């Protein structure tokens, strides 16, 4: 399992 | 020929492309808008980011599939398999690198120097760190070493600014810290710095939660949860 | 493409499929077709999946933009036209391959029906975006391809054959959605469904999942249309 | 709701 980075969503 | 197009038209078309799930087009429109030479708004930084991360995201996913097939093929060591997958992995790799270079080019030629506030400067330096990290994933050489260093320097400069200029709950600061932690763990083989940075980030944020709007609270806690997910993974 | 061996083109299409890189997959298959050998069933599947992914994306985009254009300066029309031209391009490439290499008087019925079905489909996708006297010609081309395919399939294939079924399903869609012919759509789908079910006991096990899928879609469209 | 055509799956 790879580490989670910042999601690709509008913020 | 986007040089002569109205900036507002480029932005509108980027939004149409987004609705149509045409992310290559969306990115090209936002590149054209960047090249008009004006600063970006918040919405525009979102459009730029979403567009290019969809493009590079697809390429990264494809590269990962191909690399795995390549490696599995080579390990089996059958004297007739392997050349095709290598060549095709290289093809996708070349395209990914080209997109990353485009983004880094925009950041260097237009966006980082021209930013008028700390928040947007940090966003752009974060972006630079991210696209160097995406380059690092496929790099091998001494090249890999130089790229890792470039990523680290971009992230460190962003972190230095965000600590002086922004609250610990700010989503840009949080997303930067999340990503720099992933860099430490996945790229720079420094699991201890990863964990330490994630822990500090999550705790400093947590302390200030009570100050936030209802909406701001949801934004910040989203990233804090991923910080948490990673800490659970790394321990 | 032409500098690569046929076997390498097929291998690279399969890799591109695994990587969800459908434009590349389609380009690889086009190179393979251009080698001048017939395609196997597996290879026809690769060709079909590749180009349908590409056009499918363009169709979804065109529909989004078209909807916005109808609800809503010059930008939406300009951008819808750009996407439309690209879609027409891909359709033209497919139809080009079918005409220049794939459709032949010879070869088994399966292959002939498959490629004529495909010809009908890609003219149908052109008809979705056409307006002119052009639209009329396009519709007639789709109808002519589908009808030839139907004639072969009725003569040479069993009623529950999955290629025959998929052709009939798509021709029924043509009738309903393109040709303003709901009566014929419903009559063709109902006839197809019943004749297929009447011979389902003769269908090989290797086709059962596929044929049952298509007969379910006939049923669902019949529910929708009635 | 549009009519459903043959799905894009390997046969
Ligand atoms: O400039 C402003 C104000 N708005 C742009 C916005 C772009 C995205 N960034 S981001 O840091 O990449 C990001 C993305 C997703 C999540 Br969820 C959290 C953080 C934040 C700022
Ligand atoms: C044996 C042979 O020619 N196989 C390849 C084909 C590719 C897909 N076509 S189809 O588009 O008509 C079709 C029919 C049924 C399904 Br479940 C999916 C696609 C059929 C044969
Ligand atoms: Cl290649
Ligand atoms: Cl346009
Ligand atoms: Mg072997
Ligand atoms: Mg390389
Ligand atoms: Mg050759
Ligand atoms: Mg037009």
């Amino acid at each position: 399992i790879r580490s989670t980075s910042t999601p690709n969503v509008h913020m | 020929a986007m040089g002569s197009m109205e900036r507002a038209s480029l932005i509108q078309k980027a939004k149409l492309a987004e609705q149509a799930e045409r992310y290559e087009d969306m990115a090209a429109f936002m590149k054209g808008a960047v090249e008009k030479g004006e600063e970006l708004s918040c919405e525009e930084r979102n459009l730029l980011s979403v567009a290019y991360k969809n493009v590079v995201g697809g390429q990264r996913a494809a590269w990962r599939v191909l690399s795995s097939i390549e490696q599995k093929s080579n390990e089996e060591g059958s004297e007739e398999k392997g050349p095709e997958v290598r060549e095709y992995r290289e093809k996708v790799e070349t395209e990914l690198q080209g997109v990353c270079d485009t983004v880094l080019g925009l950041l260097d030629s237009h966006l980082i120097k021209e930013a008028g506030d700390a928040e947007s400067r940090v966003f752009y330096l974060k972006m630079k760190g991210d696209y160097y990290r995406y380059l690092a994933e496929v790099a091998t050489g001494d090249d890999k070493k130089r790229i890792i260093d470039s990523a680290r320097s971009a992230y460190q400069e962003a972190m230095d600014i965000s600590k002086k200029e922004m609250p610990p709950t700010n989503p840009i600061r949080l997303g930067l810290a999340l990503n720099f932690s992933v860099f430490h763990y996945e790229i720079a083989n420094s699991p201890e710095e990863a964990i330490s940075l994630a822990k500090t980030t999550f705790d400093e944020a947590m302390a200030d939660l009570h100050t936030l709007s209802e909406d701001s609270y949801k934004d910040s806690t989203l990233i804090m949860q991923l910080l948490r997910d990673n800490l659970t993974l790394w321990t």
Side-chain angles (χ1 to χ4, degrees), chain B residues 6 8-10 12-13 16-17 19-22 25-26 29 58-59 61-63 65-66 69 83-88 91-92 95:
Chain B
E6 290 196 3
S9 293
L10 294 171
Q12 187 171 348
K13 286 185 180 180
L16 292 170
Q19 287 181 84
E21 299 177 13
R22 297 267 288 184
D25 291 347
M26 189 189 175
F29 296 129
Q59 288 170 330
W63 189 96
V65 167
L66 296 172
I69 299 166
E84 287 80 1
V85 61
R86 181 181 172 89
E87 282 178 5
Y88 189 52
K91 178 199 176 84
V92 170
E95 293 185 22

PDB file of all heavy atoms in Angstrom, chain B residues 6 8-10 12-13 16-17 19-22 25-26 29 58-59 61-63 65-66 69 83-88 91-92 95:
ATOM      1  N   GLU B   6      -8.660  35.652 -25.590  1.00  0.00           N
ATOM      2  CA  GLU B   6      -9.073  36.280 -24.351  1.00  0.00           C
ATOM      3  C   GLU B   6      -8.804  35.368 -23.157  1.00  0.00           C
ATOM      4  O   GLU B   6      -9.187  34.196 -23.160  1.00  0.00           O
ATOM      5  CB  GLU B   6     -10.570  36.619 -24.347  1.00  0.00           C
ATOM      6  CG  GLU B   6     -10.921  37.749 -25.284  1.00  0.00           C
ATOM      7  CD  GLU B   6     -12.288  38.355 -25.039  1.00  0.00           C
ATOM      8  OE1 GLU B   6     -12.991  37.939 -24.083  1.00  0.00           O
ATOM      9  OE2 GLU B   6     -12.646  39.276 -25.803  1.00  0.00           O
ATOM     10  N   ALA B   8     -10.326  35.396 -20.328  1.00  0.00           N
ATOM     11  CA  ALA B   8     -11.580  34.919 -19.776  1.00  0.00           C
ATOM     12  C   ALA B   8     -12.124  33.734 -20.583  1.00  0.00           C
ATOM     13  O   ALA B   8     -12.761  32.825 -20.045  1.00  0.00           O
ATOM     14  CB  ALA B   8     -12.621  36.056 -19.696  1.00  0.00           C
ATOM     15  N   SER B   9     -11.885  33.740 -21.887  1.00  0.00           N
ATOM     16  CA  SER B   9     -12.325  32.638 -22.734  1.00  0.00           C
ATOM     17  C   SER B   9     -11.579  31.342 -22.418  1.00  0.00           C
ATOM     18  O   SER B   9     -12.160  30.252 -22.396  1.00  0.00           O
ATOM     19  CB  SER B   9     -12.178  32.975 -24.225  1.00  0.00           C
ATOM     20  OG  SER B   9     -13.092  34.028 -24.557  1.00  0.00           O
ATOM     21  N   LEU B  10     -10.271  31.468 -22.185  1.00  0.00           N
ATOM     22  CA  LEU B  10      -9.456  30.324 -21.818  1.00  0.00           C
ATOM     23  C   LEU B  10      -9.962  29.733 -20.506  1.00  0.00           C
ATOM     24  O   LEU B  10     -10.032  28.512 -20.383  1.00  0.00           O
ATOM     25  CB  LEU B  10      -7.995  30.735 -21.724  1.00  0.00           C
ATOM     26  CG  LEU B  10      -7.385  31.154 -23.052  1.00  0.00           C
ATOM     27  CD1 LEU B  10      -5.995  31.775 -22.875  1.00  0.00           C
ATOM     28  CD2 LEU B  10      -7.288  29.954 -24.014  1.00  0.00           C
ATOM     29  N   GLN B  12     -12.986  30.040 -19.190  1.00  0.00           N
ATOM     30  CA  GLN B  12     -14.285  29.426 -19.415  1.00  0.00           C
ATOM     31  C   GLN B  12     -14.150  28.031 -20.050  1.00  0.00           C
ATOM     32  O   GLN B  12     -14.880  27.085 -19.694  1.00  0.00           O
ATOM     33  CB  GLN B  12     -15.085  30.350 -20.312  1.00  0.00           C
ATOM     34  CG  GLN B  12     -16.520  29.938 -20.520  1.00  0.00           C
ATOM     35  CD  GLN B  12     -17.230  31.074 -21.246  1.00  0.00           C
ATOM     36  OE1 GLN B  12     -16.678  32.214 -21.356  1.00  0.00           O
ATOM     37  NE2 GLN B  12     -18.434  30.807 -21.720  1.00  0.00           N
ATOM     38  N   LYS B  13     -13.262  27.930 -21.052  1.00  0.00           N
ATOM     39  CA  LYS B  13     -13.036  26.684 -21.776  1.00  0.00           C
ATOM     40  C   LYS B  13     -12.395  25.644 -20.877  1.00  0.00           C
ATOM     41  O   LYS B  13     -12.721  24.469 -20.970  1.00  0.00           O
ATOM     42  CB  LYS B  13     -12.197  26.880 -23.022  1.00  0.00           C
ATOM     43  CG  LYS B  13     -13.048  27.584 -24.155  1.00  0.00           C
ATOM     44  CD  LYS B  13     -12.318  27.701 -25.470  1.00  0.00           C
ATOM     45  CE  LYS B  13     -13.137  28.358 -26.507  1.00  0.00           C
ATOM     46  NZ  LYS B  13     -12.389  28.453 -27.785  1.00  0.00           N
ATOM     47  N   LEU B  16     -15.386  24.260 -19.051  1.00  0.00           N
ATOM     48  CA  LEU B  16     -16.131  23.370 -19.940  1.00  0.00           C
ATOM     49  C   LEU B  16     -15.410  22.019 -20.076  1.00  0.00           C
ATOM     50  O   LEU B  16     -16.033  20.955 -20.026  1.00  0.00           O
ATOM     51  CB  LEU B  16     -16.281  23.976 -21.291  1.00  0.00           C
ATOM     52  CG  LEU B  16     -17.197  25.229 -21.368  1.00  0.00           C
ATOM     53  CD1 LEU B  16     -17.096  25.900 -22.697  1.00  0.00           C
ATOM     54  CD2 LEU B  16     -18.670  24.819 -20.936  1.00  0.00           C
ATOM     55  N   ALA B  17     -14.082  22.067 -20.273  1.00  0.00           N
ATOM     56  CA  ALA B  17     -13.307  20.850 -20.433  1.00  0.00           C
ATOM     57  C   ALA B  17     -13.409  20.009 -19.165  1.00  0.00           C
ATOM     58  O   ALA B  17     -13.467  18.773 -19.235  1.00  0.00           O
ATOM     59  CB  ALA B  17     -11.832  21.149 -20.826  1.00  0.00           C
ATOM     60  N   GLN B  19     -15.944  19.927 -17.016  1.00  0.00           N
ATOM     61  CA  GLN B  19     -17.250  19.272 -17.013  1.00  0.00           C
ATOM     62  C   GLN B  19     -17.333  18.095 -17.975  1.00  0.00           C
ATOM     63  O   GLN B  19     -18.018  17.105 -17.728  1.00  0.00           O
ATOM     64  CB  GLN B  19     -18.314  20.337 -17.353  1.00  0.00           C
ATOM     65  CG  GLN B  19     -18.557  21.301 -16.198  1.00  0.00           C
ATOM     66  CD  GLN B  19     -19.598  22.281 -16.597  1.00  0.00           C
ATOM     67  OE1 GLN B  19     -20.796  21.989 -16.479  1.00  0.00           O
ATOM     68  NE2 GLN B  19     -19.167  23.447 -17.126  1.00  0.00           N
ATOM     69  N   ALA B  20     -16.627  18.169 -19.106  1.00  0.00           N
ATOM     70  CA  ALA B  20     -16.605  17.098 -20.082  1.00  0.00           C
ATOM     71  C   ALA B  20     -15.574  15.994 -19.815  1.00  0.00           C
ATOM     72  O   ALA B  20     -15.399  15.108 -20.649  1.00  0.00           O
ATOM     73  CB  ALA B  20     -16.307  17.687 -21.409  1.00  0.00           C
ATOM     74  N   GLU B  21     -14.835  16.140 -18.719  1.00  0.00           N
ATOM     75  CA  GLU B  21     -13.801  15.202 -18.273  1.00  0.00           C
ATOM     76  C   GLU B  21     -12.720  15.099 -19.331  1.00  0.00           C
ATOM     77  O   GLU B  21     -12.113  14.050 -19.562  1.00  0.00           O
ATOM     78  CB  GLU B  21     -14.394  13.817 -17.865  1.00  0.00           C
ATOM     79  CG  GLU B  21     -15.367  13.975 -16.724  1.00  0.00           C
ATOM     80  CD  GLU B  21     -16.034  12.678 -16.310  1.00  0.00           C
ATOM     81  OE1 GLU B  21     -15.568  11.610 -16.743  1.00  0.00           O
ATOM     82  OE2 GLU B  21     -17.044  12.745 -15.589  1.00  0.00           O
ATOM     83  N   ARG B  22     -12.458  16.236 -19.971  1.00  0.00           N
ATOM     84  CA  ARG B  22     -11.381  16.335 -20.942  1.00  0.00           C
ATOM     85  C   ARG B  22     -10.150  17.006 -20.335  1.00  0.00           C
ATOM     86  O   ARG B  22      -9.908  18.193 -20.603  1.00  0.00           O
ATOM     87  CB  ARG B  22     -11.829  17.158 -22.106  1.00  0.00           C
ATOM     88  CG  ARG B  22     -13.012  16.499 -22.858  1.00  0.00           C
ATOM     89  CD  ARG B  22     -12.518  15.682 -23.931  1.00  0.00           C
ATOM     90  NE  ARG B  22     -11.992  16.488 -25.021  1.00  0.00           N
ATOM     91  CZ  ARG B  22     -11.556  16.001 -26.156  1.00  0.00           C
ATOM     92  NH1 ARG B  22     -11.808  14.744 -26.503  1.00  0.00           N
ATOM     93  NH2 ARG B  22     -10.847  16.785 -26.969  1.00  0.00           N
ATOM     94  N   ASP B  25      -7.193  18.807 -22.468  1.00  0.00           N
ATOM     95  CA  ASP B  25      -7.654  20.089 -22.961  1.00  0.00           C
ATOM     96  C   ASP B  25      -7.687  21.128 -21.840  1.00  0.00           C
ATOM     97  O   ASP B  25      -7.268  22.265 -22.016  1.00  0.00           O
ATOM     98  CB  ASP B  25      -9.047  19.988 -23.615  1.00  0.00           C
ATOM     99  CG  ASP B  25      -9.162  19.249 -24.933  1.00  0.00           C
ATOM    100  OD1 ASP B  25      -8.126  18.970 -25.547  1.00  0.00           O
ATOM    101  OD2 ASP B  25     -10.318  18.912 -25.322  1.00  0.00           O
ATOM    102  N   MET B  26      -8.263  20.753 -20.698  1.00  0.00           N
ATOM    103  CA  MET B  26      -8.352  21.632 -19.556  1.00  0.00           C
ATOM    104  C   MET B  26      -6.978  22.182 -19.165  1.00  0.00           C
ATOM    105  O   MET B  26      -6.821  23.387 -18.957  1.00  0.00           O
ATOM    106  CB  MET B  26      -8.950  20.862 -18.392  1.00  0.00           C
ATOM    107  CG  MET B  26      -9.328  21.676 -17.137  1.00  0.00           C
ATOM    108  SD  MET B  26      -9.754  20.550 -15.785  1.00  0.00           S
ATOM    109  CE  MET B  26      -9.971  21.706 -14.517  1.00  0.00           C
ATOM    110  N   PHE B  29      -5.757  24.711 -21.777  1.00  0.00           N
ATOM    111  CA  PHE B  29      -6.403  26.002 -21.575  1.00  0.00           C
ATOM    112  C   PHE B  29      -5.839  26.799 -20.405  1.00  0.00           C
ATOM    113  O   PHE B  29      -5.622  28.019 -20.518  1.00  0.00           O
ATOM    114  CB  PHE B  29      -7.930  25.878 -21.460  1.00  0.00           C
ATOM    115  CG  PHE B  29      -8.661  25.380 -22.703  1.00  0.00           C
ATOM    116  CD1 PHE B  29      -9.551  24.328 -22.625  1.00  0.00           C
ATOM    117  CD2 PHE B  29      -8.504  26.007 -23.914  1.00  0.00           C
ATOM    118  CE1 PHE B  29     -10.244  23.907 -23.725  1.00  0.00           C
ATOM    119  CE2 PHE B  29      -9.210  25.578 -25.041  1.00  0.00           C
ATOM    120  CZ  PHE B  29     -10.055  24.534 -24.953  1.00  0.00           C
ATOM    121  N   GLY B  58      -2.985   9.957 -14.416  1.00  0.00           N
ATOM    122  CA  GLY B  58      -3.270   8.859 -15.337  1.00  0.00           C
ATOM    123  C   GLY B  58      -1.964   8.223 -15.836  1.00  0.00           C
ATOM    124  O   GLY B  58      -1.832   7.004 -15.931  1.00  0.00           O
ATOM    125  N   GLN B  59      -1.022   9.086 -16.195  1.00  0.00           N
ATOM    126  CA  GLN B  59       0.283   8.662 -16.674  1.00  0.00           C
ATOM    127  C   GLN B  59       1.013   7.874 -15.598  1.00  0.00           C
ATOM    128  O   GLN B  59       1.632   6.855 -15.910  1.00  0.00           O
ATOM    129  CB  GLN B  59       1.088   9.873 -17.100  1.00  0.00           C
ATOM    130  CG  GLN B  59       0.611  10.528 -18.376  1.00  0.00           C
ATOM    131  CD  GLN B  59       1.296  11.842 -18.599  1.00  0.00           C
ATOM    132  OE1 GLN B  59       1.681  12.536 -17.660  1.00  0.00           O
ATOM    133  NE2 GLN B  59       1.404  12.227 -19.857  1.00  0.00           N
ATOM    134  N   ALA B  61      -0.309   6.236 -13.019  1.00  0.00           N
ATOM    135  CA  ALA B  61      -0.976   4.963 -12.855  1.00  0.00           C
ATOM    136  C   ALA B  61      -0.550   3.973 -13.938  1.00  0.00           C
ATOM    137  O   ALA B  61      -0.253   2.800 -13.616  1.00  0.00           O
ATOM    138  CB  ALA B  61      -2.500   5.142 -12.791  1.00  0.00           C
ATOM    139  N   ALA B  62      -0.441   4.444 -15.183  1.00  0.00           N
ATOM    140  CA  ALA B  62      -0.114   3.595 -16.314  1.00  0.00           C
ATOM    141  C   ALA B  62       1.342   3.151 -16.182  1.00  0.00           C
ATOM    142  O   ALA B  62       1.664   1.979 -16.374  1.00  0.00           O
ATOM    143  CB  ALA B  62      -0.319   4.323 -17.616  1.00  0.00           C
ATOM    144  N   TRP B  63       2.224   4.103 -15.849  1.00  0.00           N
ATOM    145  CA  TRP B  63       3.623   3.786 -15.642  1.00  0.00           C
ATOM    146  C   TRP B  63       3.797   2.710 -14.581  1.00  0.00           C
ATOM    147  O   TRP B  63       4.577   1.753 -14.743  1.00  0.00           O
ATOM    148  CB  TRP B  63       4.405   5.054 -15.284  1.00  0.00           C
ATOM    149  CG  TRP B  63       5.879   4.862 -15.251  1.00  0.00           C
ATOM    150  CD1 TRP B  63       6.753   5.134 -16.247  1.00  0.00           C
ATOM    151  CD2 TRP B  63       6.652   4.400 -14.157  1.00  0.00           C
ATOM    152  NE1 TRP B  63       8.030   4.820 -15.844  1.00  0.00           N
ATOM    153  CE2 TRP B  63       7.988   4.359 -14.570  1.00  0.00           C
ATOM    154  CE3 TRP B  63       6.344   3.963 -12.888  1.00  0.00           C
ATOM    155  CZ2 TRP B  63       9.018   3.943 -13.716  1.00  0.00           C
ATOM    156  CZ3 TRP B  63       7.350   3.549 -12.050  1.00  0.00           C
ATOM    157  CH2 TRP B  63       8.680   3.540 -12.466  1.00  0.00           C
ATOM    158  N   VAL B  65       1.614   0.360 -13.626  1.00  0.00           N
ATOM    159  CA  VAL B  65       1.205  -0.932 -14.163  1.00  0.00           C
ATOM    160  C   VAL B  65       2.314  -1.527 -15.033  1.00  0.00           C
ATOM    161  O   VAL B  65       2.659  -2.713 -14.864  1.00  0.00           O
ATOM    162  CB  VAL B  65      -0.099  -0.795 -14.938  1.00  0.00           C
ATOM    163  CG1 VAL B  65      -0.404  -2.007 -15.756  1.00  0.00           C
ATOM    164  CG2 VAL B  65      -1.224  -0.459 -13.981  1.00  0.00           C
ATOM    165  N   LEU B  66       2.876  -0.697 -15.921  1.00  0.00           N
ATOM    166  CA  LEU B  66       3.853  -1.157 -16.893  1.00  0.00           C
ATOM    167  C   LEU B  66       5.164  -1.574 -16.219  1.00  0.00           C
ATOM    168  O   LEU B  66       5.741  -2.611 -16.589  1.00  0.00           O
ATOM    169  CB  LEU B  66       4.110  -0.113 -17.995  1.00  0.00           C
ATOM    170  CG  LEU B  66       2.908   0.198 -18.886  1.00  0.00           C
ATOM    171  CD1 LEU B  66       3.185   1.328 -19.774  1.00  0.00           C
ATOM    172  CD2 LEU B  66       2.426  -1.056 -19.713  1.00  0.00           C
ATOM    173  N   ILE B  69       4.632  -5.035 -14.662  1.00  0.00           N
ATOM    174  CA  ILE B  69       4.710  -6.046 -15.712  1.00  0.00           C
ATOM    175  C   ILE B  69       6.153  -6.268 -16.180  1.00  0.00           C
ATOM    176  O   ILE B  69       6.584  -7.423 -16.360  1.00  0.00           O
ATOM    177  CB  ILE B  69       3.779  -5.720 -16.891  1.00  0.00           C
ATOM    178  CG1 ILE B  69       2.326  -5.669 -16.426  1.00  0.00           C
ATOM    179  CG2 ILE B  69       3.931  -6.684 -18.064  1.00  0.00           C
ATOM    180  CD1 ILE B  69       1.414  -5.040 -17.425  1.00  0.00           C
ATOM    181  N   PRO B  83      11.170  -7.017 -24.152  1.00  0.00           N
ATOM    182  CA  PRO B  83      11.481  -5.831 -24.961  1.00  0.00           C
ATOM    183  C   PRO B  83      10.294  -4.902 -25.228  1.00  0.00           C
ATOM    184  O   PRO B  83      10.433  -3.687 -25.166  1.00  0.00           O
ATOM    185  CB  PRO B  83      11.970  -6.414 -26.249  1.00  0.00           C
ATOM    186  CG  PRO B  83      12.493  -7.769 -25.855  1.00  0.00           C
ATOM    187  CD  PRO B  83      11.589  -8.260 -24.817  1.00  0.00           C
ATOM    188  N   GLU B  84       9.132  -5.491 -25.492  1.00  0.00           N
ATOM    189  CA  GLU B  84       7.957  -4.681 -25.792  1.00  0.00           C
ATOM    190  C   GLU B  84       7.538  -3.863 -24.577  1.00  0.00           C
ATOM    191  O   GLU B  84       7.253  -2.688 -24.708  1.00  0.00           O
ATOM    192  CB  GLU B  84       6.800  -5.515 -26.276  1.00  0.00           C
ATOM    193  CG  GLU B  84       7.033  -6.020 -27.701  1.00  0.00           C
ATOM    194  CD  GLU B  84       7.924  -7.216 -27.861  1.00  0.00           C
ATOM    195  OE1 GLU B  84       8.427  -7.759 -26.853  1.00  0.00           O
ATOM    196  OE2 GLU B  84       8.112  -7.603 -29.031  1.00  0.00           O
ATOM    197  N   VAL B  85       7.440  -4.497 -23.422  1.00  0.00           N
ATOM    198  CA  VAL B  85       6.964  -3.784 -22.247  1.00  0.00           C
ATOM    199  C   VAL B  85       7.962  -2.710 -21.824  1.00  0.00           C
ATOM    200  O   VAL B  85       7.569  -1.614 -21.431  1.00  0.00           O
ATOM    201  CB  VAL B  85       6.568  -4.717 -21.106  1.00  0.00           C
ATOM    202  CG1 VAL B  85       7.732  -5.542 -20.637  1.00  0.00           C
ATOM    203  CG2 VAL B  85       5.967  -3.931 -19.932  1.00  0.00           C
ATOM    204  N   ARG B  86       9.262  -2.992 -21.934  1.00  0.00           N
ATOM    205  CA  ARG B  86      10.236  -1.970 -21.654  1.00  0.00           C
ATOM    206  C   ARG B  86      10.016  -0.751 -22.540  1.00  0.00           C
ATOM    207  O   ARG B  86       9.991   0.379 -22.050  1.00  0.00           O
ATOM    208  CB  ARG B  86      11.655  -2.583 -21.870  1.00  0.00           C
ATOM    209  CG  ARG B  86      12.732  -1.658 -21.605  1.00  0.00           C
ATOM    210  CD  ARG B  86      14.093  -2.385 -21.879  1.00  0.00           C
ATOM    211  NE  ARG B  86      15.165  -1.424 -21.803  1.00  0.00           N
ATOM    212  CZ  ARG B  86      15.790  -1.144 -20.684  1.00  0.00           C
ATOM    213  NH1 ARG B  86      15.482  -1.773 -19.566  1.00  0.00           N
ATOM    214  NH2 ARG B  86      16.730  -0.208 -20.683  1.00  0.00           N
ATOM    215  N   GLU B  87       9.867  -0.983 -23.838  1.00  0.00           N
ATOM    216  CA  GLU B  87       9.759   0.091 -24.811  1.00  0.00           C
ATOM    217  C   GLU B  87       8.501   0.922 -24.547  1.00  0.00           C
ATOM    218  O   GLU B  87       8.536   2.154 -24.634  1.00  0.00           O
ATOM    219  CB  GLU B  87       9.633  -0.397 -26.248  1.00  0.00           C
ATOM    220  CG  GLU B  87      10.939  -0.849 -26.906  1.00  0.00           C
ATOM    221  CD  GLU B  87      10.787  -1.382 -28.327  1.00  0.00           C
ATOM    222  OE1 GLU B  87       9.664  -1.338 -28.892  1.00  0.00           O
ATOM    223  OE2 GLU B  87      11.826  -1.793 -28.897  1.00  0.00           O
ATOM    224  N   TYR B  88       7.416   0.217 -24.214  1.00  0.00           N
ATOM    225  CA  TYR B  88       6.159   0.925 -23.965  1.00  0.00           C
ATOM    226  C   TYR B  88       6.187   1.682 -22.625  1.00  0.00           C
ATOM    227  O   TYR B  88       5.738   2.835 -22.555  1.00  0.00           O
ATOM    228  CB  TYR B  88       5.011  -0.048 -24.073  1.00  0.00           C
ATOM    229  CG  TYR B  88       3.687   0.693 -24.048  1.00  0.00           C
ATOM    230  CD1 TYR B  88       3.443   1.756 -24.903  1.00  0.00           C
ATOM    231  CD2 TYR B  88       2.726   0.394 -23.094  1.00  0.00           C
ATOM    232  CE1 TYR B  88       2.245   2.481 -24.835  1.00  0.00           C
ATOM    233  CE2 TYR B  88       1.530   1.063 -23.058  1.00  0.00           C
ATOM    234  CZ  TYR B  88       1.304   2.121 -23.906  1.00  0.00           C
ATOM    235  OH  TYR B  88       0.086   2.751 -23.726  1.00  0.00           O
ATOM    236  N   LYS B  91       7.921   4.759 -23.329  1.00  0.00           N
ATOM    237  CA  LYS B  91       7.087   5.695 -24.063  1.00  0.00           C
ATOM    238  C   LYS B  91       6.242   6.508 -23.078  1.00  0.00           C
ATOM    239  O   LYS B  91       6.200   7.734 -23.176  1.00  0.00           O
ATOM    240  CB  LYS B  91       6.249   4.979 -25.149  1.00  0.00           C
ATOM    241  CG  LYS B  91       5.331   5.936 -25.915  1.00  0.00           C
ATOM    242  CD  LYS B  91       4.208   5.154 -26.636  1.00  0.00           C
ATOM    243  CE  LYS B  91       3.230   6.095 -27.327  1.00  0.00           C
ATOM    244  NZ  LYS B  91       3.768   6.463 -28.630  1.00  0.00           N
ATOM    245  N   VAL B  92       5.533   5.821 -22.177  1.00  0.00           N
ATOM    246  CA  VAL B  92       4.689   6.491 -21.205  1.00  0.00           C
ATOM    247  C   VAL B  92       5.516   7.382 -20.286  1.00  0.00           C
ATOM    248  O   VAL B  92       5.113   8.489 -19.944  1.00  0.00           O
ATOM    249  CB  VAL B  92       3.927   5.442 -20.405  1.00  0.00           C
ATOM    250  CG1 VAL B  92       3.226   6.057 -19.210  1.00  0.00           C
ATOM    251  CG2 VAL B  92       2.929   4.688 -21.304  1.00  0.00           C
ATOM    252  N   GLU B  95       6.322  10.653 -21.920  1.00  0.00           N
ATOM    253  CA  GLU B  95       5.176  11.542 -21.912  1.00  0.00           C
ATOM    254  C   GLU B  95       4.928  12.188 -20.537  1.00  0.00           C
ATOM    255  O   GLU B  95       4.606  13.372 -20.461  1.00  0.00           O
ATOM    256  CB  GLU B  95       3.913  10.809 -22.377  1.00  0.00           C
ATOM    257  CG  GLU B  95       3.973  10.417 -23.820  1.00  0.00           C
ATOM    258  CD  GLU B  95       2.715   9.784 -24.417  1.00  0.00           C
ATOM    259  OE1 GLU B  95       1.612  10.005 -23.850  1.00  0.00           O
ATOM    260  OE2 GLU B  95       2.859   9.136 -25.490  1.00  0.00           O
TER     261      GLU B  95
END
